[PDB]
Design a protein around this ligand. Sequence first.
Ligand SMILES: O=C(O)CCCC[C@@H]1SC[C@@H]2NC(=O)N[C@@H]21
Ligand SMILES: O=C(O)CCCC[C@@H]1SC[C@@H]2NC(=O)N[C@@H]21
Ligand SMILES: O=C(O)CCCC[C@@H]1SC[C@@H]2NC(=O)N[C@@H]21
Lengths: 114, 120, 118, 118
Amino acid sequence: GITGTWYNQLGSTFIVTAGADGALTGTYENAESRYVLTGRYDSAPATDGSGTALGWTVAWKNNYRNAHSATTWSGQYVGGAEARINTQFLLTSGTTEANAWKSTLVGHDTFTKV
Amino acid sequence: GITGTWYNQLGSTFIVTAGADGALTGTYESAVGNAESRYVLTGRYDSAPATDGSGTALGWTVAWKNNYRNAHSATTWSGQYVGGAEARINTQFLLTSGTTEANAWKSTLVGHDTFTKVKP
Amino acid sequence: GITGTWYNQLGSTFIVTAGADGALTGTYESAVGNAESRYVLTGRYDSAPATDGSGTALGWTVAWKNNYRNAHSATTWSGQYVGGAEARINTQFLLTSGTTEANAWKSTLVGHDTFTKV
Amino acid sequence: GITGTWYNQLGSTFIVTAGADGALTGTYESAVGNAESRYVLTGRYDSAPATDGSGTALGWTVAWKNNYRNAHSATTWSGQYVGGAEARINTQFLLTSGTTEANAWKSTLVGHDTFTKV
Ligand SMILES: O=C(O)CCCC[C@@H]1SC[C@@H]2NC(=O)N[C@@H]21
Ligand SMILES: O=C(O)CCCC[C@@H]1SC[C@@H]2NC(=O)N[C@@H]21
Ligand SMILES: O=C(O)CCCC[C@@H]1SC[C@@H]2NC(=O)N[C@@H]21
């Protein structure tokens, strides 16, 4: 039950649809704040109570702005009434070769159905 | 630039196409790990980079299941393309596996790959 | 306020002393992993932080060898202390194991721990 | 094998002493960033490694403050030492700065460094 609307604590929001083939498509977010998303998930997880692996990408360019960057989220989906997606991310900005060593940030996030 | 065939330091093969819309589609084949044959990838990239010599931000995802195997896991690559005499794509990765609640502390690997158009 | 006994979300115990000019010393007990009993740690912290409401940066290291067991591994924790009603330390970690050079692509785990005194 | 002078591709230098008790002590001097001069380092390493051809696990920390400048930030390195005719230390790092609560999601950078005896 990944298909739907998810929320984090800092006010961001995303709507996804999960395909039977393992595809993930949606938008991350006013129009000025919407971005395309795309990803993949394991459409045949284990039955031993492990979570379902997935990930997705967003570049921070739309018809109105371009921050010259992209983020990837990597983590897992856990069902139940407390259904959540736990992730860790990587955010990279384009840079001159001299400044590449400080081009990527790392962090974590949790999304809920409510 | 980005469209084409790439090889990393491990002998893996990354075949990709860059759309005019900022979309990334293709196929991935790994030399290491619980995998065999090709897998579907999808990603995004900045289709209008700055002009000051900076790199082009990009990223993509792979879920390790196909018609031969399933490893119950997925990897995301996050990086930048740099044009030049020697074109290359430098990245960092996060590899997450499906675990129980108890072992989630050891579910994610972190690493770094460098892709190049010549096979080393 | 860094000196003292802290605990994390998994059950691990971290006991620290902060020296007058940047030293960090103490022991760690992990509630999980191939571990058993106490281990030595050592680290550093910012001894003159900004006075505009930002946190205090620090880090520390542990190697998993003691008189009872050795996992041939090490962890590093990077983060910041925040003072207040609920003093907390927010970190991220890297845990590297020794491998052959062919398995090096899978040597290092990544995650995060939050410590409190409750 | 570890005690001595090491160099990275960026132009930075570090001098380290590896103790018989598993400690790492020394000095670091960067070439890139908000820093000038020497800074203190401290760490730990596996003092009874295996010989199946695995490497030796280690880690260390620097806080970016000395008698000349303060950068309100800290770095930890975690990785492994590899013997051989071309010895080296392969690592990944976490660099964290002091921030307020609102900029906490963008406080930590990640990267990798290779050190040789050159
Ligand atoms: O074993 C698995 O769980 C799936 C295979 C993972 C292969 C990884 S992805 C990061 C690194 N780069 C590669 O080309 N292969 C490995
Ligand atoms: O190599 C081992 O098995 C021992 C690792 C110790 C467990 C880890 S270290 C990061 C995380 N925080 C903890 O308190 N425990 C785990
Ligand atoms: O606070 C700063 O801006 C300076 C920190 C030092 C720069 C980094 S630490 C990781 C990497 N390795 C180096 O030798 N220099 C950079």
